[PDB]
Motif scaffolding. Sequence first.
Motif: not given
Length: 822
Positions: A71-88
């Motif tokens: 899953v790719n997650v970012k915050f409302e304000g910025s361009e920077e994002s993080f791609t996590f491995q999580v579980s369903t």
Amino acid sequence: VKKLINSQISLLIGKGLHEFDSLRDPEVNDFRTKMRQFCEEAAAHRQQLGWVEWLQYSFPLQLEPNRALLVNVKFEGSEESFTFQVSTKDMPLALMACALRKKATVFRQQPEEYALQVNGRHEYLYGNYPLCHFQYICSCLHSGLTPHLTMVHSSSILAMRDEQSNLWSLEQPFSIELIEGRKVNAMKLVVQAGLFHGNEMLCKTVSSSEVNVCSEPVWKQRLEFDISVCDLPRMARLCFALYAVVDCPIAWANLMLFDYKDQLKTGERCLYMWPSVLLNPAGTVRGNPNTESAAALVIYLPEVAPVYFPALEKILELLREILERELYEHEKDLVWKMRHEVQEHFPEALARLLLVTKWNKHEDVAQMLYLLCSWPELPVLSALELLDFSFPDCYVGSFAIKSLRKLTDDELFQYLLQLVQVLKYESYLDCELTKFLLGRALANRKIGHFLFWHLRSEMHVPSVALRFGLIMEAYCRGSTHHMKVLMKQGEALSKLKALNDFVKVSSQKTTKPQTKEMMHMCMRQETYMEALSHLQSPLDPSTLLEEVCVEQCTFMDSKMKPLWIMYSSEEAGSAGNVGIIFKNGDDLRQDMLTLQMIQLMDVLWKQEGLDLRMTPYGCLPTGDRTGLIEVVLHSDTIANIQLNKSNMAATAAFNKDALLNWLKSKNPGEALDRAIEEFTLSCAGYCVATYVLGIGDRHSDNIMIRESGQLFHIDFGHFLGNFRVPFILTYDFVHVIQQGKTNNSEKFERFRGYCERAYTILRRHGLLFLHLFALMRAAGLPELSCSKDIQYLKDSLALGKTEEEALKHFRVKFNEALRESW
Ligand SMILES: Cc1ccccc1-n1c(Cn2nc(-c3ccc(O)c(F)c3)c3c(N)ncnc32)nc2cccc(C)c2c1=O
């Protein structure tokens, strides 16, 4: 400000508010003021909702009816994002936790303060649900794609909230005086009159004396009815038909004997009649608004003394089982005799007892009502039956709504189309169903959106324009902000109509390439670019239509010349690349009902763990033979694929291999197996769906297939056999299911198993389909007009059988279909 809002409502609803005033009608006046009050109180409650409750109002959760994922997650304000491995299996909170921990390290250092927005969409992930219970996360898994989400803080959510702020005595036989008329015909005139309580006659249908087809007819005669005045029930309907004879129907008109204040009507009435297609009990109890052209019948109701219907307090003062699952007169007598036992031991048999009570005897009605007032609430399924026109009494209607209050928003949404149609059966403007629908709509903005469009789409129908206009006005009073959002949609639809008319003219004088270029020039005008961009999709208000992609817009150069309109959104990425089809010229109601029923089948199947990989795309009537259809991208017609063109990846030695070759080309290597499976499952779903609904004229031009392998149907228009349609197996489809082998009983019998499973599940919900179609009779669809049409469904689901009999029956049909297949 108030003048601006009034003009904005007038434009949005398609009716000027001054037209309500001009009627000088107390019932209209009262409806307007009460419902405005009701709706404004709802808006006040909404503006103080906590932030989680606001999300629930504006962005209700989209849920489905161990494993790892990116899953790719970012915050409302910025361009920077993080791609996590999580579980369903992980909760949204855990994902928000990882996000906040990551931001803290990058940005040098509370999950419960956030909700996750799906990028570019009005759709949010929140609550105690594993990620794979969310439709979006599900969608990504089956498609392959990576979920892209945005951490949205509670203060951002509150900012959205904040910016969105606003009697027994009378024994004489009932009678009327037929005075005169003013009509048009060729013969003699006769007026037939009958008194009704729903479908049921309250006595025989007394008729006029015959008078010549001259005038301006004049009758001046008392019509006496075989019923005491004290026996007329609260919801008594008086029904007229004017016709000619040496049969030739001319017109009809109904009215309630009691007005909206329970007062019995007197004296004289001018009934503005509706032109005929003899008696029409289900027809509206309001006059034809075209008072210039309409034939008119003046009648007189004599002054029987003011008399009101008694208050409830005065009313309240005044082999069983073997049959109980149409009945003879002695059977009816037993049921009525045992009414107390019905209540105490068979509460779900309320409808059967209602159909045996004598509504033309006030004593019997009193006895029925007393039991009704202590009757336990019934299941939703039972309450849907009670909304039928067979149950006209207002206490029954009020009981029905009370049992329907436990509908989930998801259920309400599934049945919304039918509940709006039931408004057409209403006798008065201010009624329990309208209040219910308006309340639910103000508490859930998705419900509000679709209620609006169901009502807006019928404003061109004179019989409902007043009622529906008034409901839409009231709704607007309760959300000024949503009104503006809806106006933006209406403005886009106005521009699309104008653009479509242009294309219809241009394409008659020029080639498709030339017209397409003209279409693009028109669209690139500032007025069009602005009106067509930055709106919520009327098909699904969670889909945002951002920038119109002119160079990808086109039209179909045949039939009604529908438009293909594409959109893109930087913020939404891939999921923002969406299309809408605008079609003007066809009645979309039949398409919409068919699609909604298939969507319901899909839900019922998934509830039993059967996912037939259906394609429930949106279809939304918006106006007079106008609406939108959701584009299914990356799909083609079977017909186009079967053209078997050269120089293509799918070019075949035998034409029967074209579809399989196409699927191979879109799904190379190890991907083929899954696509063949998606094809098989969806084929089974649609074969069962179209069999059950009696959808005929299926052919290669109205079946499409997605690159995933999923089959689906387009362009419905015929159902319940209104072309007995056989089960259909198509040879080219059997060929794909069999993996291109002549014989493959292993694959083919698995397919047969899917069909049988789907069919048996639908049968178990047979009563739900029957109740829903019964309500749909209110809509005036020419292919759903009588009992013969309901009977079609009964037969197709073989509901009078055991499961074993039904399946044998289904098997013969399936086997007959296989033989027929080449
Ligand atoms: C996309 C396509 C492939 C092969 C043959 C026809 C089409 N197609 C189609 C086939 N089609 N029909 C529908 C459709 C489905 C239900 C409807 O009631 C309806 F009016 C149209 C459709 C859809 N929902 N998604 C994707 N394709 C769909 N519809 C068009 C509508 C307007 C304009 C155009 C140029 C098209 C169009 O080209």
